[PDB]
Design a protein around this nucleic acid. Structure first.
Ligand SMILES: [Mg+2]
Ligand SMILES: [Mg+2]
Ligand SMILES: [Mg+2]
Ligand SMILES: [Mg+2]
Ligand SMILES: [Mg+2]
Ligand SMILES: [Mg+2]
Ligand SMILES: [Mg+2]
Ligand SMILES: [Mg+2]
Ligand SMILES: [Mg+2]
Ligand SMILES: [Mg+2]
Ligand SMILES: [Mg+2]
Ligand SMILES: [Mg+2]
Ligand SMILES: [Mg+2]
Ligand SMILES: [Mg+2]
Ligand SMILES: [Mg+2]
Ligand SMILES: [Mg+2]
Ligand SMILES: [Mg+2]
Ligand SMILES: [Mg+2]
Ligand SMILES: [Mg+2]
Ligand SMILES: [Mg+2]
Ligand SMILES: [Mg+2]
Ligand SMILES: [Mg+2]
Ligand SMILES: [Mg+2]
Ligand SMILES: [Mg+2]
Ligand SMILES: [Mg+2]
Ligand SMILES: [Mg+2]
Ligand SMILES: [Mg+2]
Ligand SMILES: [Mg+2]
Ligand SMILES: [Mg+2]
Ligand SMILES: [Mg+2]
Ligand SMILES: [Mg+2]
Ligand SMILES: [Mg+2]
Ligand SMILES: [Mg+2]
Ligand SMILES: [Mg+2]
Ligand SMILES: [Mg+2]
Ligand SMILES: [Mg+2]
Ligand SMILES: [Mg+2]
Ligand SMILES: [Mg+2]
Ligand SMILES: [Mg+2]
Ligand SMILES: [Mg+2]
Ligand SMILES: [Mg+2]
Ligand SMILES: [Mg+2]
Ligand SMILES: [Mg+2]
Ligand SMILES: [Mg+2]
Ligand SMILES: [Mg+2]
Ligand SMILES: [Mg+2]
Ligand SMILES: [Mg+2]
Ligand SMILES: [Mg+2]
Ligand SMILES: [Mg+2]
Ligand SMILES: [Mg+2]
Ligand SMILES: [Mg+2]
Ligand SMILES: [Mg+2]
Ligand SMILES: [Mg+2]
Ligand SMILES: [Mg+2]
Ligand SMILES: [Mg+2]
Ligand SMILES: [Mg+2]
Ligand SMILES: [Mg+2]
Ligand SMILES: [Mg+2]
Ligand SMILES: [Mg+2]
Ligand SMILES: [Mg+2]
Ligand SMILES: [Mg+2]
Ligand SMILES: [Mg+2]
Ligand SMILES: [Mg+2]
Ligand SMILES: [Mg+2]
Ligand SMILES: [Mg+2]
Ligand SMILES: [Mg+2]
Ligand SMILES: [Mg+2]
Ligand SMILES: [Mg+2]
Ligand SMILES: [Mg+2]
Ligand SMILES: [Mg+2]
Ligand SMILES: [Zn+2]
Lengths: 10, 37, 204, 174, 140
RNA sequence: CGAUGUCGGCUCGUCGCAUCCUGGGGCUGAAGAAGGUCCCAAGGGUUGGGCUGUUCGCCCAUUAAAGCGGCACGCGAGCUG
RNA sequence: CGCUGAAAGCAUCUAAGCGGGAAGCCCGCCCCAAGAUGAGGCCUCCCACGGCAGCCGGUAAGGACCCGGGAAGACCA
């Protein structure tokens, strides 16, 4: 299920 | 065999039997044969 | 439950009824029985067999005694066959007739420290499309916090081969008693020169 | 209304010896051991065996009848014997005796051979009638069931192995 | 005055015929004997109970439907590695384990409790090899 | 919130059973063959492809079958991105 | 799914007892395996050596070291 990134990429 | 929580006599020839810790219904009519479950 | 010790000599094929039969040739005879294990004495039943003659110069004293008690000239290898009790004081290839089916046990060839693709036929990683230094790696080895560990027995890299292997139900193609040769159809564990055990088969 | 209390007529000359928890029943046709509850008293009378129960507790009442009938059947077994007849029905279907054994031809790709266990005797008067006989009522009835099971009565056709006196109830097909 | 502490004592050997006794209620008595709690000089931090020999373990008894229903359990550490063996079968294959397993659970855990369990010697069948110890037959 | 990296894929499994297949069975408006329906059963098995990032789904060609779920929507100090 | 069978004069696979019955379960096959400290067993070999369940010394059967190698192997084994 697509849900949004809660963290950004490192 | 019908398997259900409610076992009942269906016709007047139905016989309620308890067998190895389970309730069955045995009958000359095979359709009526039931075990509780 | 007949059995015999022997060395793998090598493979070829013979022709039998216009058919090529791939075979491994085993030098089997002759194996002096050097101890019998008995239910009274030992608790079970079997025959310790000896095989290939040894230079007495190389046989220490405890060994010599064991051989002596049998009236048996020293031999390089001792191995038991279980639930077998030959009438003779010597076992030879004659205990097998062509047509019989056997099980052969060998020490398999040693691959040493083997990766997961050779040991377990893992698929490894892509070779392109971005795979980064993981072309022959195993991938995941687990879940997350549950269960938080790796199963005992998880297939992983490590030593592989030089192991006891028993291939089963091989046909006896021929037996050449005059040269102590047993010809078995198919393949037998281990290198040429390696020691093997040939038993009556347990399949029906 | 009652089986335990009803006495067991014992004919000349079958014997009934009691022992704690078993009774032995001898007769013209052999012996039979009736394992029987420690709690019931088996009582030997003139030409009569009776069984008595310690109380009118449910288990006791239950053991009571079973015990009489068990003994009564033992008695009859060693005197008159016991038997069941099976009729075979349907075109291919036949029986015949191969030595002491019973061979059944009932439409399989092979015939079915039944061996008599100790105490059982197979008899084939006509070829579509089989008789199973012995002094042990359960064993007889059992072997009969075994034989019958080789080829149950079809649901659609008078065909298969039937007990004598067993009614043919078929259903239509189309 | 300080509570008395026994100097080392020579341990008593005891024999118990298990035939027909009820598994659990025989077990607790065995446990007591092993701890040493029948002794007025009982001391909790040393092994001073009896050595216990039990024979006819295969003829232990059990109430209810346990032969069919009591399941002994072993975990191998491998996936799928829980073996369930039922009383019947255990009796049928390694009967001495049934008494053994019961008493073991009624001993303390730890180094000492482990040691006490070693002092229990259980045999299926009427005989035992501990004659050299002249074990004192004990009715329990 | 002085950081518990987040969808899909790959890799690697392991478990549940409310079983997709295979084994056993009762009833059937079960002649037969084939089905339906329920029961027991988790040992094993459960394909390749077109589309789309897709999970899903649709589709082609097969199959005994092309099961559904849990494992931080299993698995980024294992890869991808 | 049964046999035999009461309670419950009939009936009942069940309450006593006995039978049949799954790719499943236990055994069977293959591999590991006595650190199985519950440390198993068998065969063979050495031997009751000097000085003061202990220490020091020289040996026994045997072992290791070193070397030439090996379809064994990362070193080790
Ligand atoms: Mg209703
Ligand atoms: Mg009504
Ligand atoms: Mg009826
Ligand atoms: Mg070998
Ligand atoms: Mg190698
Ligand atoms: Mg690899
Ligand atoms: Mg491989
Ligand atoms: Mg490959
Ligand atoms: Mg690949
Ligand atoms: Mg590749
Ligand atoms: Mg790729
Ligand atoms: Mg990159
Ligand atoms: Mg690369
Ligand atoms: Mg993660
Ligand atoms: Mg954990
Ligand atoms: Mg190795
Ligand atoms: Mg030839
Ligand atoms: Mg080679
Ligand atoms: Mg009389
Ligand atoms: Mg009286
Ligand atoms: Mg139709
Ligand atoms: Mg006491
Ligand atoms: Mg044992
Ligand atoms: Mg505590
Ligand atoms: Mg946070
Ligand atoms: Mg922190
Ligand atoms: Mg941080
Ligand atoms: Mg973390
Ligand atoms: Mg993301
Ligand atoms: Mg899964
Ligand atoms: Mg289910
Ligand atoms: Mg099916
Ligand atoms: Mg059909
Ligand atoms: Mg039709
Ligand atoms: Mg069906
Ligand atoms: Mg059903
Ligand atoms: Mg399964
Ligand atoms: Mg599984
Ligand atoms: Mg599955
Ligand atoms: Mg294209
Ligand atoms: Mg695609
Ligand atoms: Mg898609
Ligand atoms: Mg879609
Ligand atoms: Mg199909
Ligand atoms: Mg697909
Ligand atoms: Mg979720
Ligand atoms: Mg996830
Ligand atoms: Mg998933
Ligand atoms: Mg992830
Ligand atoms: Mg990453
Ligand atoms: Mg991901
Ligand atoms: Mg991670
Ligand atoms: Mg990380
Ligand atoms: Mg991490
Ligand atoms: Mg990786
Ligand atoms: Mg009937
Ligand atoms: Mg009846
Ligand atoms: Mg009535
Ligand atoms: Mg019963
Ligand atoms: Mg049964
Ligand atoms: Mg039957
Ligand atoms: Mg059976
Ligand atoms: Mg199979
Ligand atoms: Mg071994
Ligand atoms: Mg050892
Ligand atoms: Mg060993
Ligand atoms: Mg242990
Ligand atoms: Mg040892
Ligand atoms: Mg070297
Ligand atoms: Mg080297
Ligand atoms: Zn009815």
């Amino acid at each position: 299920v697509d849900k949004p990134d809660y963290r950004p990429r490192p | 065999m019908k398997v259900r929580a409610s076992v009942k006599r269906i016709c007047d020839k139905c016989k309620v039997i308890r067998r190895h810790g389970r309730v069955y219904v045995i009958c000359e009519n095979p359709k009526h044969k039931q075990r509780q479950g | 439950m007949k059995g015999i010790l022997g060395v793998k000599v090598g493979m070829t094929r013979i022709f039998r009824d216009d058919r090529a039969v791939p075979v491994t040739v085993i030098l089997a005879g002759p194996c002096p029985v050097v101890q019998r294990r008995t239910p009274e004495k030992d608790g079970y039943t079997a025959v310790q067999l000896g095989f290939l003659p040894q230079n007495p110069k190389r046989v220490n004293r405890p060994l010599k005694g064991h051989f002596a008690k049998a009236g048996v000239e020293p031999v390089r290898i001792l191995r038991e066959i279980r639930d077998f009790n030959p009438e003779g004081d010597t076992v030879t290839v004659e205990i097998f007739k062509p047509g019989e089916r056997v099980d052969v046990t060998g020490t398999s060839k040693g691959r040493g420290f083997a990766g997961v693709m050779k040991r377990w036929n893992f698929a490894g990683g892509p070779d392109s499309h971005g795979a980064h230094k993981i072309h022959r790696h195993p991938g995941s080895i687990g879940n997350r916090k549950t269960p938080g560990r790796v199963y005992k027995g998880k297939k992983m890299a490590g030593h592989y081969g030089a192991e006891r292997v028993t291939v089963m139900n091989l046909e006896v193609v021929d037996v050449i008693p005059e040269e102590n040769l047993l010809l078995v159809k198919g393949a037998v564990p281990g290198p040429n020169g390696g020691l093997v055990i040939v038993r009556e088969t347990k399949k029906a | 209304s009652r089986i335990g209390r009803l006495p067991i007529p014992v004919p000349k000359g079958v014997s009934v010896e009691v022992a704690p928890g078993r009774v032995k029943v001898k007769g013209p046709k052999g012996e039979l051991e009736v394992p029987v509850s420690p709690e019931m008293r088996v009582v030997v009378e003139e030409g009569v065996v009776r069984v008595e129960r310690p109380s009118d507790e449910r288990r006791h009442k239950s053991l009571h009848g079973l015990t009489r009938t068990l003994i009564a059947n033992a008695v009859k077994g060693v005197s008159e014997g016991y038997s069941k007849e099976l009729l075979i029905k349907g075109i291919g279907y036949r029986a015949r005796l191969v030595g002491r054994a019973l061979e059944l031809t009932v439409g399989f790709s092979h015939p079915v051979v039944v061996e008599p266990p100790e105490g059982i005797t197979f008899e084939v008067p006509e070829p579509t009638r089989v008789r199973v006989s012995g002094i042990d009522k359960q064993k007889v009835g059992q072997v009969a069931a075994n034989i019958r099971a080789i080829r149950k009565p079809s649901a659609y056709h008078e065909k298969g192995i039937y007990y004598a006196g067993e009614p043919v109830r078929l259903k239509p097909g189309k | 005055m300080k509570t008395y502490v026994p100097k080392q004592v020579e341990p008593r050997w005891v024999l118990i015929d298990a035939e027909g006794k009820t598994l659990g209620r025989l077990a607790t008595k065995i446990a007591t004997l092993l701890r040493g709690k029948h002794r007025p000089d009982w001391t909790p931090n040393v092994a001073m109970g009896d050595f216990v020999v039990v024979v006819n373990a295969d003829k232990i008894r059990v109430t209810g439907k346990k032969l069919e229903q009591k399941i002994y359990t072993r975990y191998s550490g491998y996936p799928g590695g829980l073996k369930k063996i039922p009383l019947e079968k255990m009796l049928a294959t390694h009967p001495e384990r049934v008494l053994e397993h019961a008493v073991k659970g009624m001993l303390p855990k730890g180094p000492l409790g482990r040691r006490l369990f070693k002092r229990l010697k259980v045999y299926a069948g009427p005989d035992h090899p501990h004659q050299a110890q002249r074990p004192e037959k004990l009715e329990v």
